């Protein structure tokens, strides 16, 4: 009968490719709470 619409599904990669990291130099004065 009439064909079904294409559907996407949320998936997650294999457990070693779930997260990728990138680094920054922490300066402790860069971020403050103005309040």
């Amino acid at each position: 009968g009439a064909m079904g619409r294409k559907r996407k599904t949320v998936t997650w990669p294999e457990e070693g490719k779930l997260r990728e990291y990138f680094y920054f130099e922490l300066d402790e004065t860069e971020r403050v709470n103005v309040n």
Binding site: K8, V10, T11, P13, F24, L26, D27, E30, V32, N33
Partner: protein, 294 residues
């Protein structure tokens, strides 16, 4: 309006140490507000978006972290973006943050999207820094101008009919997507109701159904609420922000909900990583995580 010059000046300070301000003119910012406001109203209040795109949580004026995110994720238009709100308050550079975001909205209106968080509300940002920042660096009149802009931000997004996105979370008054569509802009954020909840609610592991929220506003909701909602609406995932989490992202209710928080070392008071979520063409999702080199 010279958008390219505005953007160039905003990006110019990348790599500075210490971080400089970018001081646009009053009229440039008013231009950004007014032109972006028109775009927000010409687009649905419940956005319907297609993958691939990158999704970011709270920024809170941490402008150099935003530049870090774009540096790694790809500067527009190299990647499509959806931000979940909370651009201002708490941090040093709310102004540079919101201006760059509005500028990108105007420049790439079909590939760049901003949701409203609870801090995009005058009653809130009068208290938590943005008012002071405007008054200090410009004037109160400009603050009101932003307010009018914020009042027109969209509230939620659905990616390829499967990922429901909003700043805070779910509402007990949310039975149909049409109720969201029906909300009229401009509007403030009320102390109660559907709009409030979408910007304010939190998931909670120890609650069954709907609980009271320690914020003194809105509610908490449990894993079963999430399951029933996804099932009812044929969705796979709730993507939200609003709570700082140690790894920059955090799963809830199996992997049915994720919390994203993009401002690392949040306002100097937390040791959290910041994360964004990459959603590919197929809705395979993954995390790009910003953390200190140490």
């Amino acid at each position: 309006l010279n958008l390219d010059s505005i953007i160039g000046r905003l990006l110019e300070v990348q790599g500075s140490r210490p971080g400089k301000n970018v001081q646009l003119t009053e009229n440039e910012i008013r231009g950004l507000c007014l032109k972006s406001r028109e775009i927000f109203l010409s687009q649905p209040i419940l956005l319907e978006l297609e993958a691939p795109l990158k999704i970011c949580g709270d920024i809170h004026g941490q402008y150099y972290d935003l530049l870090r995110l774009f540096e790694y994720g790809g500067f527009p238009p190299e990647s499509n973006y959806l931000f979940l709100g909370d651009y201002v308050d708490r941090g040093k550079q709310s102004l540079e943050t919101i201006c760059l975001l509005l500028a990108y909205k105007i420049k790439y209106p079909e590939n760049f999207f901003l949701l409203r968080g609870n801090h995009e509300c005058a009653s809130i940002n009068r208290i938590y820094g943005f008012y002071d920042e405007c008054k200090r660096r410009y004037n109160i009149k400009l603050w009101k101008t932003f307010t009018d802009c914020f009042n027109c931000l969209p509230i939620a997004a659905i990616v390829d009919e499967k990922i429901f996105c909003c700043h805070g979370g779910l509402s007990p008054d949310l039975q149909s997507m049409e109720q969201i569509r029906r909300i009229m802009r401009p509007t403030d954020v009320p102390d109660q109701g559907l709009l409030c909840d979408l910007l304010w609610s939190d998931p909670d592991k120890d609650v069954q159904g709907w609980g009271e929220n320690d914020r003194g506003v809105s509610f908490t909701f449990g894993a079963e609420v999430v399951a029933k909602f996804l099932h009812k609406h044929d969705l796979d995932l709730i993507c939200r922000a609003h709570q700082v989490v140690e790894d920059g992202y955090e799963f809830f209710a199996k992997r049915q909900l994720v919390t994203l928080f993009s401002a690392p070392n949040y306002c100097g008071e937390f040791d959290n990583a910041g994360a964004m979520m990459s959603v590919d063409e197929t809705l395979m999702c993954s995390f790009q995580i910003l953390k200190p080199a140490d």
